[PDB]
Amino acid sequence: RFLKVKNWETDVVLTDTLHLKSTLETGCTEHICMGSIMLPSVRTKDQLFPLAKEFLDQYYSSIKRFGSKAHMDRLEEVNKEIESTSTYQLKDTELIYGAKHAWRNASRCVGRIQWSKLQVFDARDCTTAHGMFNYICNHVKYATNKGNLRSAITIFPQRTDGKHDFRVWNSQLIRYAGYKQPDGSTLGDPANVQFTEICIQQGWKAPRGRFDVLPLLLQANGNDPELFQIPPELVLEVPIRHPKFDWFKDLGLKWYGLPAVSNMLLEIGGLEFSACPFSGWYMGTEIGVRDYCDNSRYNILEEVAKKMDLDMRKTSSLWKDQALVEINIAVLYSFQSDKVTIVDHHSATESFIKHMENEYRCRGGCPADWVWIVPPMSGSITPVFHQEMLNYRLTPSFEYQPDPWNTHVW
Amino acid sequence: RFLKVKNWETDVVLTDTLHLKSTLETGCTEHICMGSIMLPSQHTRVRTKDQLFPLAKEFLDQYYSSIKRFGSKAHMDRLEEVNKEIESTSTYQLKDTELIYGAKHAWRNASRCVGRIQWSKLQVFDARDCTTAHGMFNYICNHVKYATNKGNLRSAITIFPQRTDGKHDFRVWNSQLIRYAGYKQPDGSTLGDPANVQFTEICIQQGWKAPRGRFDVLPLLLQANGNDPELFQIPPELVLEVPIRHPKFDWFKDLGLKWYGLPAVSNMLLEIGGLEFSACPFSGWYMGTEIGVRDYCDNSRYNILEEVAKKMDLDMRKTSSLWKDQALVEINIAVLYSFQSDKVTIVDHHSATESFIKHMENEYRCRGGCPADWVWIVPPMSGSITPVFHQEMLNYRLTPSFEYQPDPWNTHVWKG
Ligand code: HEM
Ligand code: HEM
Ligand SMILES: Cc1cc(CCc2cc(CCN(C)C)cc(F)c2F)nc(N)n1
Ligand SMILES: Cc1cc(CCc2cc(CCN(C)C)cc(F)c2F)nc(N)n1
Numbered sequence: 001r002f003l004k005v006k007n008w009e010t011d012v013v014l015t016d017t018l019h020l021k022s023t024l025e026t027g028c029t030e031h032i033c034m035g036s037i038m039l040p041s042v043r044t045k046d047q048l049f050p051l052a053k054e055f056l057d058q059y060y061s062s063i064k065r066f067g068s069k070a071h072m073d074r075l076e077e078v079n080k081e082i083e084s085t086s087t088y089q090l091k092d093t094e095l096i097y098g099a100k101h102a103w104r105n106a107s108r109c110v111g112r113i114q115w116s117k118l119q120v121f122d123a124r125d126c127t128t129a130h131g132m133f134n135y136i137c138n139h140v141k142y143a144t145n146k147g148n149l150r151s152a153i154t155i156f157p158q159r160t161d162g163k164h165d166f167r168v169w170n171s172q173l174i175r176y177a178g179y180k181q182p183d184g185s186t187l188g189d190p191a192n193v194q195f196t197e198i199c200i201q202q203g204w205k206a207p208r209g210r211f212d213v214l215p216l217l218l219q220a221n222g223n224d225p226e227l228f229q230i231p232p233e234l235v236l237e238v239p240i241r242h243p244k245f246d247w248f249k250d251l252g253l254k255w256y257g258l259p260a261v262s263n264m265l266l267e268i269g270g271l272e273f274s275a276c277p278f279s280g281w282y283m284g285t286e287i288g289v290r291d292y293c294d295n296s297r298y299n300i301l302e303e304v305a306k307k308m309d310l311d312m313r314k315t316s317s318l319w320k321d322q323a324l325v326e327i328n329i330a331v332l333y334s335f336q337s338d339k340v341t342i343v344d345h346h347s348a349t350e351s352f353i354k355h356m357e358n359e360y361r362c363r364g365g366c367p368a369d370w371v372w373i374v375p376p377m378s379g380s381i382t383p384v385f386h387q388e389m390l391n392y393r394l395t396p397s398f399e400y401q402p403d404p405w406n407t408h409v410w
Numbered sequence: 411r412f413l414k415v416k417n418w419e420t421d422v423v424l425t426d427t428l429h430l431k432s433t434l435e436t437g438c439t440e441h442i443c444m445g446s447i448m449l450p451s452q453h454t455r456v457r458t459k460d461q462l463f464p465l466a467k468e469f470l471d472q473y474y475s476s477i478k479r480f481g482s483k484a485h486m487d488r489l490e491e492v493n494k495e496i497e498s499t500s501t502y503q504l505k506d507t508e509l510i511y512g513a514k515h516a517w518r519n520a521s522r523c524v525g526r527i528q529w530s531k532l533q534v535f536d537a538r539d540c541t542t543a544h545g546m547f548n549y550i551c552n553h554v555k556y557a558t559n560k561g562n563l564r565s566a567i568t569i570f571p572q573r574t575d576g577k578h579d580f581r582v583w584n585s586q587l588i589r590y591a592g593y594k595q596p597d598g599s600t601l602g603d604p605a606n607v608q609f610t611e612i613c614i615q616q617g618w619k620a621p622r623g624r625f626d627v628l629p630l631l632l633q634a635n636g637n638d639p640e641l642f643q644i645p646p647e648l649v650l651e652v653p654i655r656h657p658k659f660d661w662f663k664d665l666g667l668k669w670y671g672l673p674a675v676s677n678m679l680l681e682i683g684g685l686e687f688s689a690c691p692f693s694g695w696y697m698g699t700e701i702g703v704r705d706y707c708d709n710s711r712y713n714i715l716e717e718v719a720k721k722m723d724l725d726m727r728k729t730s731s732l733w734k735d736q737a738l739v740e741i742n743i744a745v746l747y748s749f750q751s752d753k754v755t756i757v758d759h760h761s762a763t764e765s766f767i768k769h770m771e772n773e774y775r776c777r778g779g780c781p782a783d784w785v786w787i788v789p790p791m792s793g794s795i796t797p798v799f800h801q802e803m804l805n806y807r808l809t810p811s812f813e814y815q816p817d818p819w820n821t822h823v824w825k826g
């Protein structure tokens with residue numbers, strides 16, 4: 001019950017004890033593994049205090065003041081505040097710690113070696129969509145940093161009764177619109193067809209291009225959401241060209257520099273932050289493999305192979321694989337040439353292996369979701385393919401939450 | 411209680427009731443997922459008459475259900491006959507019909523196998539009358555001949571006598587019937603297949619005269635009735651090999667690469683109705699990535715990415731040039747081209763995974779589910795451009811089944 005994990009390429013063996021601190025549940029049982037399910041299926045005053053005590057217990061341990069002076073004081077203080085108000089407010093130091101460790105604990109995240117460098121922006125004093133917009137613009141400008149990207153999170157006021165939730169209705173702060181055509185096919189990003197519909201169904205006048213940055217749809221204190229246009233000078237974009245094939249720039253492709261997830265929920269000490277946009281920088285395959293080549297997305301593999309004059313009549317010519325590689329060489333070359341931070345899947349997975357070693361050494365483990373850590377191309381020539389990983393849920397954490405337009409009383 | 415899985419690229423949803431018929435444990439709990447452990451405690455494997463009859467009874471209920479005779483007089487008479495055989499002899503014997511059903515359904519239940527659409531067209535060779543290593547050699551030669559079929563490969567399995575007290579096991583000591591030797595040089599480098607250095611040494615110590623080349627078919631090391639194992643050389647005219655060339659790169663033949671055509675796993679344990687068949691070599695035909703991605707490009711195997719990238723002259727200084735990815739695609743194009751050119755059966759990973767989705771959906775329709783191990787079903791290159799990447803999958807353990815077992819040289823009691 002002190003588990004071991006082995007790397008089959010190097011025979012490195014790590015022992016995991018961290019998992020015994022795990023609290024929440026995975027969805028698996030002894031009779032069935034759900035490890036490939038995408039998304040496995042307010043607080044009463046009672047269950048809130050054990051949540052706060054457990055979080056405070058680990059916070060004060062991390063500063064080497066467990067069972068100390070201030071620890072028992074803070075424990076009493078939070079105890080008192082809950083019985084009366086049926087919630088409590090985090091100190092700044094605890095908010096920063098809680099956010100860094102939600103990332104540290106994100107078992108699907110390969111870029112976690114950077115976890116302790118996160119820049120945490122407290123936006124708990126915000127009251128309106130306009131203020132939200134202002135916090136978000138400042139986040140975007142800070143994180144972009146003229147292409148020298150910096151990790152950042154901005155944390156909006158916590159849930160109170162579920163009627164006054166702060167929510168960013170976009171799934172990412174920067175995404176391209178998607179339009180359905182009269183002739184069935186889809187122009188732009190197919191993932192965002194419904195969201196693009198809501199924005200137009202809200203007032204947005206769409207340019208109807210293939211790369212239209214979506215407006216922000218911001219909801220403060222449970223009110224109706226409001227549209228906002230992110231100033232273009234804050235949306236850093238990269239035109240995609242290839243280091244060998246000059247015809248590549250003619251394809252008219254680009255992508256944005258800043259990946260900023262905005263629809264997740266951040267859980268710290270039992271408190272729920274339903275608007276907490278966070279951003280880092282891209283691994284190349286996220287754009288080149290998934291965004292560009294998923295059949296349900298931009299699905300560009302047909303055009304690239306054609307302009308490569310590859311025999312596309314048999315799958316066994318591996319023309320898709322061959323095209324896929326070139327696209328991803330192009331994304332990397334484009335960002336690197338424009339001095340925008342990006343990491344290739346070989347470097348990021350190699351760093352994650354080093355990060356696992358560190359976590360096993362200094363923390364006793366590292367929860368990790370193999371199905372999501374292995375890149376979606378060239379899996380077995382990356383070190384994470386040959387790495388056994390234990391997956392388990394730790395708190396603080398990021399969780400999924402319902403889309404607001406299915407829930408909001410409009 | 412029902413369970414659903416979703417294909418996120420097509421939004422197709424399927425409903426699994428078959429997992430209820432599952433007994434054996436997975437390794438996971440409510441608080442930890444062992445989904446990526448290579449050899450979990452439960453996927454690996456003597457039984458007393460205590461627990462044996464319930465396993466027989468459950469197999470026989472399955473068997474007679476499948477032939478629409480559940481509860482029939484033939485069904486009840488067989489249960490009775492098996493019970494009395496177990497109490498008086500402590501084991502039992504499967505009928506030929508039950509052996510065939512058992513082996514097919516062990517393949518059907520193999521949740522890590524992407525090739526299962528073919529499961530009902532398996533040729534089963536009954537070798538339970540075999541008694542000596544020489545007899546095993548003769549059975550395996552005939553399997554290899556039948557399965558190879560001059561390049562028109564045919565799925566086959568050969569089943570040697572079942573375990574009795576664990577002291578009289580039949581075992582094929584090789585991990586596959588056909589594999590290339592690997593030699594450790596004094597300078598630390600490896601000649602041949604590094605995956606086989608340990609087994610190669612065992613063969614040499616047993617008397618094999620190794621040619622010490624880069625592609626030497628290993629001898630068979632066969633164990634009958636718990637006796638010491640013996641070496642046999644498969645007749646070379648039965649080992650179909652394919653020289654590897656590339657359809658555009660004429661310098662690729664000069665790498666001197668070749669592979670064998672018949673993939674034939676020989677170290678698994680087959681479990682049917684509580685009976686353990688410790689020697690049961692089985693064979694199919696290759697998916698190209700098994701050779702092109704893993705055999706040739708795993709850093710711990712032949713590891714040819716360097717030499718291929720050199721002769722392609724790629725930027726090998728920075729990894730962000732994706733020279734490794736570029737070389738890997740070419741090597742896998744060359745493997746598929748060489749096999750198709752020589753009319754030796756092979757399937758590419760796009761075709762195989764598409765077939766498996768069709769197989770899987772059909773299994774949900776007519777069977778109520780299909781256990782599948784996503785970590786193993788998704789191919790080791792170009793994962794997300796194959797449809798299984800986007801397919802939710804439920805993994806659970808059904809019997810009959812194939813199981814791992816310890817390598818015999820770690821458990822064998824040597825006669826001398
Ligand atoms: C700094 C560079 C980063 C890289 C290269 C990176 C990379 C990735 C990748 C490839 C995934 C897989 C999900 C997908 O393919 O869509 C992922 C998941 C995730 N990332 Fe990271 N990420 C980075 C930064 C961050 C930061 C700053 C945070 C939070 C502060 C974060 C939180 C998460 C979470 C919560 C998930 C998974 C959500 C789930 O459970 O499904 N990441 N990341
Ligand atoms: C017909 C062509 C076949 C193909 C293309 C195929 C393909 C595969 C592949 C790619 C794997 C993943 C294992 C690895 O990558 O090393 C696998 C696993 C497996 N295959 Fe198939 N297979 C075929 C036929 C068979 C047959 C005939 C059997 C037995 C009757 C079989 C039984 C299994 C089993 C038990 C596993 C699981 C191995 C484990 O648990 O580690 N396969 N197969
Ligand atoms: C900050 C950051 C995040 C990511 C991963 C993108 C990401 C994507 C999803 C949606 C998954 N799918 C259902 C669409 C959920 C997430 F929490 C998530 F973080 N990458 C990079 N480079 N930086
Ligand atoms: C008949 C057949 C089998 C296979 C899969 C190869 C295979 C590999 C392993 C070892 C797993 N790993 C630790 C190396 C165990 C197996 F049972 C197994 F069947 N493929 C093809 N084409 N045909």
Ligand SMILES: C[C@H](O)[C@H](O)[C@H]1CNc2nc(N)[nH]c(=O)c2N1
Binds near residue numbers: 373803
């Ligand atoms: C079906 C499967 O769970 C789903 O496709 C997952 C698999 N692994 C993934 N891995 C990453 N990094 N991102 C993803 O979106 C997914 N999707």
Ligand SMILES: C[C@H](O)[C@H](O)[C@H]1CNc2nc(N)[nH]c(=O)c2N1
Binds near residue numbers: 008386388785787
């Ligand atoms: C650690 C990890 O579970 C292990 O490397 C697995 C991953 N998936 C695999 N999938 C296949 N088809 N074959 C393998 O050998 C492996 N190895």
Ligand SMILES: [Zn+2]
Binds near residue numbers: 032034
């Ligand atoms: Zn699991």
